[PDB]
Amino acid sequence: QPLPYDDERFADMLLEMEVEGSLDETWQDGRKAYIEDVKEILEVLRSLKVRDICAIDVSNKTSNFDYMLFGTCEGPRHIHLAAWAVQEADALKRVCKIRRKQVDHTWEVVPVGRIIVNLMQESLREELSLERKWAVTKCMDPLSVANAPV
Amino acid sequence: RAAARRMQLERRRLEASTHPPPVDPTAQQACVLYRRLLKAGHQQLLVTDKSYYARKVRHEFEVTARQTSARVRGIMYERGQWLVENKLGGI
Amino acid sequence: LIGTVMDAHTEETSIKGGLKVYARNEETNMMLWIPPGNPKLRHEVTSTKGSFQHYLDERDKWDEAWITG
C-alpha cells in the first residue's frame, strides 16, 4: 500500500500530523479579512462606475493577501479616482495615502490590510490574468510539500 | 543509497506508466462542465459580476482549450471539476 | 512552512538553543536556523519522533539543490 507522493515517509508523517489536529492548531490565526469589507469596497467601486469587479478569496491558498479585488477602468484618471475613493473608504483604519503622481498609468494597487485592490485597464488586465491564476491555484495542501525539489 | 534511489525512481516510473495519462474531454463533457460551472457560479458568487464570470469562462473554454494541447485540455477539465467541487476556489 | 530538522544546537531546554530546518516550497528550498523563545517565530515539532532515513534523504535533496544552485 504505497503512496503516490515521492517521499512516502514524509508524506505519511504529514498526513498523520494533519489528521491528529496539529497543523490547524499551529496555523490558526484570527486576522482574517472581512467579506463585509470586501462587499463595501465592491459597492464603492460600483458607485464609481468601475467595470468587471471580481473578488477572489486567497485565504486558503498560499499567498500574502486575502480577498484580492480586481477591477478594470477606462483610463489612468479613472484609476486614480477609484484608488482615492478606496483609500477614503478605508480612511478610518487607513494609515497612509497613495501617491498623487501616478507612477504606472495602467495599474494602481491599493492595499487595505489583508485586502488588496488592483485597478487596471482592459488591455493590461487581459495581459496579466491574476484573477484566473488565483482562481485556478489549488488550496494549501499540507501534503503538497511532499514532492521532489525544483 | 544512489542505487536504492534509482530503484525507487524506476518503480515510480513503472507505476506512472501503469496509470493512465490525461485525455481531452469530448464535446458533451465540455458542455456539461461549462453548465456546471455556470450554475455553481450563479448559485454561489455574490461579489463578482455573474456576467463577467460567465464571459470569462466562455472565453477560456473557447480560446485556451483550442490554443493548448490535449494534455493541457484534460488538465483544465480536471481543474474545472475541482473548482466545481471546491466552490470555484473562492469568488 | 513545513520542514525537517537538520540539526539541534542543544539537547535540553535552554535559551542558548536553536534548531535547523529545511523548508521546501513549490520551487524554493530554504535551509534556516530558528532560535527558540522568539514570540513571532512559532516553531513546533509536529511529530513525537523522527526518522534518520528521512533525515538522510532530505539532506541529500538539500545538498543536490545547493550544488545545482
Binding site: 503516490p4 484566473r132 525544483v150 | 534511489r5 485556451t64 490554443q67 | 545545482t68
Partner: peptide, 25 residues
C-alpha cells in the same frame, strides 16, 4: 536523482497557471 529540474517559465501563462501542480507532482 533526488531533485527534479523543469523549465516552467518557458511555457505559456495559461499552461504555467492551470498545470503548475500537475507538472510539479
Amino acid at each position: 536523482a533526488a531533485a527534479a529540474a523543469a523549465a516552467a517559465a518557458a511555457a505559456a501563462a495559461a499552461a504555467a497557471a492551470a498545470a503548475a501542480a500537475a507538472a510539479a507532482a
